[PDB]
Design a protein around this nucleic acid. Structure first.
Ligand SMILES: [Mg+2]
Ligand SMILES: [Mg+2]
Lengths: 386, 82, 82
RNA sequence: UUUAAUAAAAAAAGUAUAUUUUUUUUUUUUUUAU
RNA sequence: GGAGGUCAACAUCAAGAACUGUGGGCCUUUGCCUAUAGAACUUAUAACGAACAUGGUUCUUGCCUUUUACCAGAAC
């Protein structure tokens, strides 16, 4: 009954509805296909991620951690963010039913957070809440986007090889002692089937509206296409592009963008979209709003930080166009190999200073308290940055 | 009490990449019988906020309705209230 | 109980391995042949009753009496069939 | 209708370099005297 | 002579379910068969210890900048 294959990165199993003997409803991963003559669903095409794409992502997260030695925690968080956004944005639909990719995502986030923890020379859980890693980069944290705090389906490997049982038992993904919920990225990205169905009726409405405007010569209305300014699969906003008259001549650009892997060392993760020709196909602005409600708000973020000891009047003055000063001057000089990696531990001292109540907290698991030389601070164990 | 409850329901609903997983979390909460209509209302109001319909908010509603008679009477009330 | 499900160990998994049940997952000629055989069988039951009553309390006399009973009952069923 | 809960630090020697997703287009209909 | 010792030395303590000695016969001492005397302690949901630690080598993993220090299973 199943006809199946594997295109660009997708593993697809088309099964016609007359061969089902029970029609059930499905989650995101199932595209249901249209007869287009009678406008009636006549099949379902179940999606999953190919295994070499899973291995490519795993290898990419391996390459981040090897290539980045002495490497300014914020920069590691940014590289993680791009390597997760490209993953979740390309195969959107088919993340959901792929079990080993959820497992490798859990292992990937704990490797990035373990990189920050081993940079601080402490892998203790209680020093590092989700407030450290998951606050936005303007409140002081690392700014990393989570996709691992879900529960993984785990159900009966002996029958899962034979039957496609279903999700009967959940198993824990990635937790901490304080139970903050942390939103995953997959809720905020629009799945491909919905955005294709939306694109059909949006470009159809634009066809009728343009063809009725050229009748009576209203000649257009940007006011009219305002709620439909960011629908559509070529993204209606690219129709009124800034320089479209010289992009009318750029033909053959998907293949030109793909073959840059054979002639450029530093690759690009977004080899599939071209923003001038195709639009901004994704937006993650609301994720940064919902994480701050997830961690509890600016009060429960700032009781971890060292904001109380500074004595600003308000948290609103945390936001400025901050110039780097010394290290900006020093990164351009003639400077030794050993002397240039020392420059990258200047941002890490500021990050370690800002979250220093939470890092140097008192409810520790093991740790022998020592005291600084000319002060009275007891620091539990030994962090050398702090 | 109403706003913080909507925030707890929204944060449960807004992690959990499967409809079955959000349905597991909300049926694990075991909300009392009076507030089930409020939970269904928050689910529908959150479903409206995106740019399109998704099968997440359908799957979680089906796994609510096939759990108990009270969730089905909550949905049969919420259709009339909508 | 580890009922076939779950990790083999939480060592290399970067999780706790805490597993839990999903509350969202509960869910004619042959008829005439037997009637002819029944009638002929009832007729033969009568003469086997005759043999049982004769031999219970003269081999050739009992065999000829049974044959004459089969003859008389066969003629009677040829008369009762028409 | 019911039950699964990883981790947790010291000493020594290191480390190249770029890596990125983030906000509308500006398009105005008018010519003194006949 | 009797009781006792936070006294010492020396034997002995994990194996055809398992010990030692003696007489007679066979082989040529070892060993086999047969008759006999004794066996303390430990042991069968198996061991001296109703208790329970660490070290070495080789495999298989886990943290992953390298070695110590480590994660936790197996064999010796
Ligand atoms: Mg050296
Ligand atoms: Mg060396």
């Amino acid at each position: 009954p199943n006809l199946l294959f594997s295109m660009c990165g997708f593993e697809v199993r088309i099964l016609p509805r007359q061969r089902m003997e029970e029609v059930v409803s499905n989650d995101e991963g199932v595209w249901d296909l249209v007869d287009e003559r009678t406008k009636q669903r006549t099949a379902k095409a179940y999606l999953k991620v190919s295994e070499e794409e899973i291995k490519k992502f795993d290898s990419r997260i391996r390459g981040i951690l090897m290539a980045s030695g002495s490497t300014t925690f914020t920069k590691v968080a940014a590289k993680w963010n791009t390597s997760l956004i490209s993953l979740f944005t390309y195969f959107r639909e088919a993340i959901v039913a792929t079990e080993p990719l959820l497992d490798i995502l859990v292992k990937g986030e704990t490797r990035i957070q373990n990189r920050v923890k081993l940079g601080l020379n402490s892998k203790m859980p209680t020093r590092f809440p989700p407030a450290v890693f998951y606050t936005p980069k303007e409140l002081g944290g690392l700014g990393m986007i989570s996709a691992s705090h879900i529960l993984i389906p785990a159900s009966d490997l002996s029958w899962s090889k034979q039957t496609d049982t279903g999700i009967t038992h959940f198993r824990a993904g990635m937790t901490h002692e304080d139970e903050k919920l942390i939103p995953t990225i997959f809720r905020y990205i629009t799945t491909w089937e919905n955005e294709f169905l939306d694109s059909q009726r949006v470009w159809a409405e634009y066809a009728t509206k343009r063809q009725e405007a050229i009748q009576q010569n209203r000649r257009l209305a940007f006011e009219e296409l305002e709620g439909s300014w960011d629908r559509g699969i070529p993204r209606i906003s690219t129709l009124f592009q800034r320089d479209r008259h010289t992009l009318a001549y750029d033909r053959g650009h998907r293949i030109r963008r793909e073959f840059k892997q054979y002639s450029l060392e530093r690759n690009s993760p977004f080899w599939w979209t071209n923003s001038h020709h195709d639009g901004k196909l994704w937006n993650l602005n609301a994720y940064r709003t919902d994480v701050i409600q997830a961690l509890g708000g600016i009060e429960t973020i700032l009781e971890h930080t060292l904001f109380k000891g500074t004595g600003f009047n308000s948290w609103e003055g945390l936001f400025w166009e901050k110039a780097s000063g010394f290290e900006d001057s020093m990164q351009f000089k003639k400077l030794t190999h050993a002397q240039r990696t020392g420059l990258s531990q200047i941002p890490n001292r500021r990050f370690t200073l800002w979250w220093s109540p939470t890092i140097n907290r008192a409810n520790v698991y093991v740790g022998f308290l020592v005291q600084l030389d000319l002060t009275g601070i007891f620091l539990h164990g030994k962090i050398p940055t702090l | 009490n109403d706003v913080e409850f909507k925030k707890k329901i929204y944060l449960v609903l807004k992690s959990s990449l499967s409809g079955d997983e959000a349905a597991h979390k909300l049926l694990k909460l075991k909300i009392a019988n009076n507030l089930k209509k409020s939970v269904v209302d928050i689910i529908i109001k959150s479903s409206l906020q995106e740019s399109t319909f998704s099968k997440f908010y359908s799957i979680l509603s089906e796994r609510m309705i096939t759990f108990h008679r009270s969730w089905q009477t909550a949905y049969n009330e919420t259709f009339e209230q909508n | 109980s580890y009922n076939g499900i779950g990790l083999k160990s939480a060592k290399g998994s970067s999780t706790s391995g805490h597993v839990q049940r999903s509350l969202a997952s509960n869910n004619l000629a042959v008829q005439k042949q037997i009637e002819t055989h029944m009638e002929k069988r009832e007729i033969e039951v009568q003469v086997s009753e005759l043999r049982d009553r004769l031999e219970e309390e003269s081999e050739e006399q009992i065999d000829k009496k049974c044959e004459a009973l089969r003859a008389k009952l066969t003629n009677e069923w040829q008369e009762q069939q028409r």
